[PDB]
Amino acid sequence: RYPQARLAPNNKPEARAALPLLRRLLVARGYQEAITFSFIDPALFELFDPGTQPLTLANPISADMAAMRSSLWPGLVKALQHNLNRQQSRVRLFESGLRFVGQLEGLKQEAMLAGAICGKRLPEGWANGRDGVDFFDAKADVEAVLASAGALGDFSFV
Amino acid sequence: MKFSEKWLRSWANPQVSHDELVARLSMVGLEVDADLPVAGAFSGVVVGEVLSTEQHPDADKLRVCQVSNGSETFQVVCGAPNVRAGLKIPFAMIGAELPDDFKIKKAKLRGVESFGMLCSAKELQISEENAGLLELPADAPVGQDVRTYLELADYTIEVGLTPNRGDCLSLAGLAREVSAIYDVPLAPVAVDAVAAQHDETRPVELAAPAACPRYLGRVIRNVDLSRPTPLWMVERLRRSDIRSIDPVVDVTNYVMIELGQPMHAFDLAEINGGVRVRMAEDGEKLVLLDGQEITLRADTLVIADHQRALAIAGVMGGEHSGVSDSTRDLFLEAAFFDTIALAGKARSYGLHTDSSHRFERGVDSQLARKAMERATRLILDIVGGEPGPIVEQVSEAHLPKVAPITLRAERVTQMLGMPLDAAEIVRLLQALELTVVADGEGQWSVGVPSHRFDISLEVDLIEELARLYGYNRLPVRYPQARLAPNNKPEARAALPLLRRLLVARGYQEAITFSFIDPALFELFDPGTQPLTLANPISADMAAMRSSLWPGLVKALQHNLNRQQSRVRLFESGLRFVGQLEGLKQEAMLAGAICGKRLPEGWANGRDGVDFFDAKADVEAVLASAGALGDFSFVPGEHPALHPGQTARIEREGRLVGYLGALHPELAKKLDLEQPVFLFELLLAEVVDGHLPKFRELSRFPEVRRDLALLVDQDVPAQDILTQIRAAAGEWLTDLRLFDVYHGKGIDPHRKSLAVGLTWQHPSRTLNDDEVNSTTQNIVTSLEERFNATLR
Amino acid sequence: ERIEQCFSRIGYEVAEGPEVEDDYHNFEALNIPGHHPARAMHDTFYFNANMLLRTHTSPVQVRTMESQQPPIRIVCPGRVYRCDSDLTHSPMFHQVEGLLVDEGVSFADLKGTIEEFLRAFFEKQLEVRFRPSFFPFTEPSAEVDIQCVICQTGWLEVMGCGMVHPNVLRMSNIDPEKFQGFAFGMGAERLAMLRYGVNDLRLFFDNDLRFLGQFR
Amino acid sequence: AAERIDVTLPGRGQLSGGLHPVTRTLERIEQCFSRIGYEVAEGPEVEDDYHNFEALNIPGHHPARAMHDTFYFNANMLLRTHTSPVQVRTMESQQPPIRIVCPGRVYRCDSDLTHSPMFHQVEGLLVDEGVSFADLKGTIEEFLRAFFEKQLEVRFRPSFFPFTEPSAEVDIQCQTGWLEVMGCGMVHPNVLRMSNIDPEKFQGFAFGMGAERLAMLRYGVNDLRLFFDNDLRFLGQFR
């Protein structure tokens, strides 16, 4: 049998940029989605976040998978270099996921959107210039995301 | 349907304010479109009588009057041209407060003392008439408040009726409604029979009984048509937006608006041996009272005599058989016409009347006699005369009958979502004059009254209960559904997806009219016959589009003309191909770009858009469902496009669309100076793609080799790359064209192609010998097919 | 897109049909008879005696009723055409139409559906009012009102609805004794104008980048 | 008669990238339910032993609670072993009806080649007045047909889970001719009771499925290690 339901029409607010929307935007803008482990090496954690005490596991699967991430960057940089080591030169990755801030007492679990780019600005082709990616290329990709729900004017890069 | 509230209240008085009434009416399905007062506010103005007048001794344009208010005589100086002895007029007494804060005071006009003011309709804000004094009827009651006498404490309410409420096209109908809504007594006008003073009649024949099952006729001899329409009737008609024309037309209009029965009066002298109600002969000609010479169809019912047609039954009278100056005797008509037999007939001759509207919507099949007696009394009171006996012709077999309806209490509970008590069901239905009789437990048998042409089914009765109970008092529920999980296929690129892609790629969505100018259609599609509209709104909106390009190009130039330089537009919609027989209605996705490649900015190059920019946008769309490899861009030709810059897009041989630069010649005609790039795709051929099929990754390194090739300037790069894949072996993992050179360093009929070839073996490392062997056999292949050379 | 979402989230399927239609699907099948003024060349664009430009999206719903048996839960967004255009009305415009046909469907179900869609769409817990009206295809029929919250008693007419007339189901081989149904319609430009504060209807079809750029 | 002729050469610029196959899978599962009134629910990844075990009838001595299978921070705080705690948080926050889907990252300590220390799963929960085992069978059977785009044969085998009674392992066709793809069951009365939902008035069904498992069947992926490696040669296959 199929369960019965007295359902009413409904919808989320019009002026909101949800994660599925933003993922598809970045895809159109030439990014590839990555998925990295939440637990990372304390040595790596300390490089991207000096001074902060990671939320450490009591029974990690290994010593280099003992620290809950505070940023999606250590994992992305690591996936980017894995590719660079595998004869890839143009790497454009993005990831969404939680970050873990503080110790158990007052721990913050916040959903983040992060991206990492390297290599040439464009793919190799007859009509494309041979220039390398820079800060303003990443800025363009960020502006596009921040403008997804018609509120770009509310953001400032300082 | 406009009416005086005072008149309505005289039949049914709800005992609620005017505001409460206007509110409830709209809440019960009689929407009030307007509610306005009949006149401006004023006090101290009464009916006065002019006893005498004299010439003012020191002003020729002025008169000195002696006016009585029934209690006292006052001297009043008046300049109005119509002031004279005997006149009954509105007399503003010293004290009277007239519209827009004007207080009447004692005056001394050119030496003569005046104790009041005599009024015009304009001065009292009654009418726009300021010609002279408002001459009140000879029999007006002197001393009475003019507001009371003229019933100026009133509103006019205008109702926008739905076509199912033909019954409400009269005060009799509206009062019946008000009484049902509020459950209050209905006091209808008592209409006594007028006894015959003679035995003069005229024969009446129902030659078409189905179209007219009841016709009443009366002879009224020796009428004085010089006599005027009484003020009460004029005011009642004026408050219903009916102009006073003549006493006889005014009576027939009055009766129609009071009771709902359209009636007609003929000059008795114009009836050649009695009335014959029959269908018209084909091509029979009639001149209407308005002067229009109509040529009739055999389907149309007419009122004729023994010699000719007199009127178009239920719609309009003929000129030769109407009342005139010579008229001494009348012949009154009151009939029932079938709603079906008349439906659309007035419109087909380009006519619409208050009679036509009422009969089409339905007039009470039993009302003719009551209305006839009413009109007879009014006629004798207004113009006099001696009435003869009523002639009633009736076809019982053709009279309308609505079979009794069976209403089930279960079905009312179901629809409404709550039960209603049997007493409330009965009370409500009875108030609408429905005949309710029990027919077992929770079931009745209901009969429909002769004024309702919209009740025939059980649902019509349930509507009536819902309506009178109150729609907004009824419960609110969400419908139940036995639902199962479901989803559309994974590997498909839907239009919403593609629209969002193009937005990300910097396009703006446009919406253009489907119907365009045939001149424009012909420019983008020469020789093709457009699917043309029979009744276009204009001549330049007569052709159904075969392409979304004419509209897009037009919107692009509209923007260019409005100080815009970078224009990037896209549209989705149908195209119409062929004539009705075999017409194809296909959903398309089209885009148009012009101006700079990028927006103006410090980090952006100042280059203009070209073919390869549009191509990139097309490739992105075609790659949306992982099936880009299924598409091929082949050198093509299109009449609206540049022959040197056109690509025909195909899938398995089938035509997907076109991509190219707008033909320079077309640009000239359209007054376009900039290059513009267009693409159009059949969505039916874009949507389907392929689900990913995982292919194992090798653990071994890839090997790359670059090749510089000299080929004929006119050999397509896609042809060369296709041949390379054919000769590269199984291990080729990538083939990139990274440079095209056609300059000084080489022959002007040749071009150099720099290609990057990448290979990877799934289970081992690739040695230099095998790679060099493959590279050479690719070269040998290219020398044999295209006579290629290494740079 | 926004209207579709309100319904597609609760089991409604999006239906599409042709723009060039026949008089049967466009009028006859919806209890609009031959002599009806809506069928006149003053209001309807014709190609010949029987073929026209659809005056509403209801024919798509008719095509569904003939092709399948209940349950039916469909939304029909699309371009529709009227001959009797002016400043306040356009010869071409968009409308969405709904149709639900099942076994125990009541007027309460219709009220609930319409009331919740308006609240969802306008993102406010607004007040909804139903006034009795007349339509040839529905019985009972109603005109729906909302408060002037989105800006003459502080009410606005936004859409119509009604319980599908028995003859309409019957004509499309659906037994009125077994099944019940409700339908509705709304104008897309009308809703857009209320939502975004657009004054002139002519702006939608002009395609000025200065107007369009405001909806990024 | 001007020679501005050009060819079939590739377009200029950058083209689209793509989504991760697991993301595609999760999106696809959510859609099957969100189309029929189910709300997407999310919760924390670092959870307490109550929401993760106790509230789901997993007692103290249960082997699933051991450090061999669960990652701990201290005695009471852990990395969620399943998405069920999100469903528990919903049961406490509201009264029936409840129609939710819970996609998310979950963690297991007992990893190897065939199992990953981190993976994605989707969990469903429906709680209403007249919910039967027939309702559960119908739901599961129609979702699998929808997701796999085939009118495949579905089989239910009796199994045991601490949070459901009766519980079942679901199979679809493809060495036995059948494949185990997901689990389901009627929510155990003590589970509802603990979250202040009267088992006498309300009934409910729940289910779970592994995203990588479904992705592997759908796209023909062999090695689970490919999902977390993020090689562009793997990812580029799902554009």
Ligand SMILES: O=C(Nc1cccc(S(=O)(=O)N2CCN(c3ccccn3)CC2)c1)Nc1nccs1
């Ligand atoms: O029933 C409908 N639609 C419907 C229901 C109520 C109100 C409206 S509406 O407000 O858009 N309006 C009402 C006024 N309209 C009229 C009125 C008379 C004649 C023609 N048009 C236009 C549409 C649309 N469709 C069906 N399809 C299949 C079976 S029923």
Ligand SMILES: O=C(Nc1cccc(S(=O)(=O)N2CCN(c3ccccn3)CC2)c1)Nc1nccs1
């Ligand atoms: O009941 C569920 N979920 C459920 C139901 C049946 C099967 C599965 S499953 O196959 O994913 N699997 C079964 C085996 N699992 C076990 C078994 C024992 C201990 C821990 N884990 C992991 C999950 C999930 N959740 C609820 N939330 C709130 C109330 S009920």
